Amino acid sequence: NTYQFRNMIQCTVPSRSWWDFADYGCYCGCGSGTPVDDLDRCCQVHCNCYRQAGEISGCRPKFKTYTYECSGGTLTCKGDNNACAASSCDCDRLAAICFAGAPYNDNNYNIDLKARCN
Amino acid sequence: NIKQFNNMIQCTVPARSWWDFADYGCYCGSGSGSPVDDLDRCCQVHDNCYNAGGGVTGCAPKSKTYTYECSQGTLTCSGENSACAATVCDCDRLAAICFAGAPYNDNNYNIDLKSRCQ
Ligand SMILES: CC(=O)N[C@@H]1[C@@H](O)[C@H](O)[C@@H](CO)O[C@H]1O
Ligand SMILES: [Zn+2]
Ligand SMILES: [Zn+2]
Numbered sequence: 306n307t308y309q310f311r312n313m314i315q316c317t318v319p320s321r322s323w324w325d326f327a328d329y330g331c332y333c334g335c336g337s338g339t340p341v342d343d344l345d346r347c348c349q350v351h352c353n354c355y356r357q358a359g360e361i362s363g364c365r366p367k368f369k370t371y372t373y374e375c376s377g378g379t380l381t382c383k384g385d386n387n388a389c390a391a392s393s394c395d396c397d398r399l400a401a402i403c404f405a406g407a408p409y410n411d412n413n414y415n416i417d418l419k420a421r422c423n
Numbered sequence: 424n425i426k427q428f429n430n431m432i433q434c435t436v437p438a439r440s441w442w443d444f445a446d447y448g449c450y451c452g453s454g455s456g457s458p459v460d461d462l463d464r465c466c467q468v469h470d471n472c473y474n475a476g477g478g479v480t481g482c483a484p485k486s487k488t489y490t491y492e493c494s495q496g497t498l499t500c501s502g503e504n505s506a507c508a509a510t511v512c513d514c515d516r517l518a519a520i521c522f523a524g525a526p527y528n529d530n531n532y533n534i535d536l537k538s539r540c541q
Contacts (some may be wrong), residue, residue, distance in 0.1 A: 324537035327453075328446075334453055336445060362481060415535055419442035 313401035316375035331422035338422030347403035354396035364389035428515040434493035435523035449540035456540025465521035472514035482507035
């Protein structure tokens with residue numbers, strides 16, 4: 306669920322408030338257009354990831370509570386997860402890991418979506 | 424679905440595009456914090472309507488395609504819509520109608536959420 310994903314982020318990127326990713330580029334906050342950079346593409350893969358999970362009957366990616374462990378840059382989705390929860394967890398985890406490897410460009414935060422992603 | 428909602432929006436507010444609402448206030452886009460104005464409220468409810476329809480079975484707002492019509496600024500959802508389509512469709516037309524009537528404040532577009540939506 307959203308809350309768990311927020312933790313993975315604080316996990317892999319402690320030097321930043323999860324808000325730094327609530328409105329970055331064209332995809333962090335999930336939309337469309339040309340990714341602005343590596344970090345934005347991370348979010349691009351994440352939204353698409355959520356979209357595939359939605360194809361599993363009864364699977365609400367923003368809400369599905371899953372089992373995971375986030376230990377100092379280390380993220381682990383637990384096996385005790387069903388198809389929906391397992392898929393969701395791998396989305397968030399991989400996105401969290403992705404953020405950790407992509408530069409964060411202050412320019413790309415809170416950009417004009419109407420003009421830049423359309 | 425969202426593709427149909429994007430267009431619903433233009434039916435009632437032709438002078439604008441859905442993009443003007445993609446990043447407005449604290450809700451038109453995703454969800455969080457305290458509404459900013461009438462418009463930012465229209466979006467709160469809309470989302471609520473959606474999560475209420477998610478309660479219908481196998482009902483996915485952003486993805487279920489409904490049968491609607493636009494005739495000179497006035498929207499109409501057709502009857503042949505399944506319980507899920509009909510609910511979503513209505514959500515969207517009420518939102519569209521709510522957007523046209525609410526004031527659009529440039530000052531509340533592209534706002535720094537990390538400071539106005541806690
Ligand atoms: C609270 C939270 O983490 N919300 C995430 C956001 O961080 C992420 O940037 C965005 C796009 O992929 O998807 C949202 O669901
Ligand atoms: Zn452990
Ligand atoms: Zn923004």
